[PDB]
Design an enzyme around this catalytic site. Structure first.
Site, PDB file in Angstrom:
ATOM      1  CG  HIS A   1       6.373   2.336  13.142  1.00 16.01           C
ATOM      2  ND1 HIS A   1       7.723   2.584  13.264  1.00 16.01           N
ATOM      3  CD2 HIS A   1       6.232   1.555  12.045  1.00 16.01           C
ATOM      4  CE1 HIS A   1       8.369   1.987  12.279  1.00 16.01           C
ATOM      5  NE2 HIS A   1       7.487   1.354  11.525  1.00 16.01           N
TER       6      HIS A   1
ATOM      7  CB  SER B   1      10.356  -0.458  10.886  1.00 19.42           C
ATOM      8  OG  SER B   1      10.201   0.736  10.141  1.00 19.42           O
TER       9      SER B   1
ATOM     10  CB  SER C   1      11.256   5.765  13.618  1.00 15.69           C
ATOM     11  OG  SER C   1      10.621   7.000  13.334  1.00 15.69           O
TER      12      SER C   1
ATOM     13  CG  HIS D   1      10.285   4.126  17.262  1.00 16.13           C
ATOM     14  ND1 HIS D   1       9.566   5.276  17.017  1.00 16.13           N
ATOM     15  CD2 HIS D   1       9.850   3.212  16.362  1.00 16.13           C
ATOM     16  CE1 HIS D   1       8.734   5.067  16.013  1.00 16.13           C
ATOM     17  NE2 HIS D   1       8.886   3.823  15.597  1.00 16.13           N
TER      18      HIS D   1
ATOM     19  NE  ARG E   1      11.088  -9.304   5.831  1.00 17.86           N
ATOM     20  CZ  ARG E   1      11.659  -9.987   4.841  1.00 17.86           C
ATOM     21  NH1 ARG E   1      12.896  -9.707   4.451  1.00 17.86           N
ATOM     22  NH2 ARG E   1      10.986 -10.955   4.235  1.00 17.86           N
ATOM     23  NE  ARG E   2       8.883  -0.452   0.928  1.00 21.21           N
ATOM     24  CZ  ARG E   2       8.526   0.737   0.451  1.00 21.21           C
ATOM     25  NH1 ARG E   2       9.428   1.537  -0.101  1.00 21.21           N
ATOM     26  NH2 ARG E   2       7.261   1.129   0.527  1.00 21.21           N
TER      27      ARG E   2
END
Ligand code: 24Q
Length: 192
Positions: free
Chosen positions: A44, A112, A114, A130, A138-139
């Protein structure tokens, strides 16, 4: 030159910030798919654009993302490190045929996405900003797969049916990469 990346994402609001919130995928399914390109960054960090997304689709298991890594500066650097850096190769299996793919697959396993806060979910503006390649956080998302061909990347996911894969690769092929602008990533070996 360039690469493709694929995988299921985690939807995060205000990632890396105090008010970080991991969104449930069903909270943004109404706003899928996303056919237009979003920038692909690292952790990010907005100044680490390495490429562009080529489609974010809802599927049975979650939200699958396909993207193209187009930054020549990043690809050249990552390949160099994959071939010469002992740190980079340490957590990877010994003597892989494709160092670059394994290094990326290992060091940046997370995708990920956003998103805006679920409180905003008829929103006024863009729900998504993005997608980031991440080493942490990470989940729900699965490990990202990097490959030279889009069909190879998507076909590596068993939780994605051939019909789903066909629908994905339909839009991926509908994207002209060269038309997309150059990501802003600069190699630190050139700057610092
Ligand atoms: C020449 S320098 O100024 O001294 N270099 C640096 O300061 C400097 C500082 C930090 C990092 N990277 C990290 O700390 C880091 C941590 C977790 C994951 C990753 C992603 C991958 C790691 C290896 C394969 C390529 C990228 N990177 C790098 C390598 C780098 C390379 C490609 C893209 C951004 C970063 C250089």
């Amino acid at each position: 030159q360039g690469l493709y990346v694929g995988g299921f994402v985690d939807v995060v609001s205000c990632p890396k910030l105090e008010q970080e919130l991991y969104l449930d995928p069903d909270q943004v399914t109404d706003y899928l798919p996303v056919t237009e390109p979003l920038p692909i960054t690292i952790e990010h960090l907005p100044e680490t654009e390495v490429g562009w997304t080529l489609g974010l689709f809802q599927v049975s298991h979650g939200i699958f993302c396909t993207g193209a890594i187009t930054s020549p500066a990043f690809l050249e650097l990552a390949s160099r490190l994959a071939d010469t850096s002992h740190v980079a190769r340490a957590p990877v299996k010994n003597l892989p045929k494709e160092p670059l793919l394994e290094i990326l697959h290992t060091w940046l396993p997370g995708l990920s996405l956003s998103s805006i806060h679920p409180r905003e979910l008829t929103p006024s503006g863009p729900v998504f900003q993005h997608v980031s390649l991440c080493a942490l956080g990470r989940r729900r998302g699965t490990v990202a797969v990097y490959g030279h061909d889009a069909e190879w990347v998507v076909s590596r996911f068993s939780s994605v049916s051939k019909s789903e894969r066909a629908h994905i690769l339909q839009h991926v092929s509908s994207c002209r990469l060269e038309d997309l602008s150059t990501p802003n990533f600069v190699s630190p070996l050139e700057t610092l």
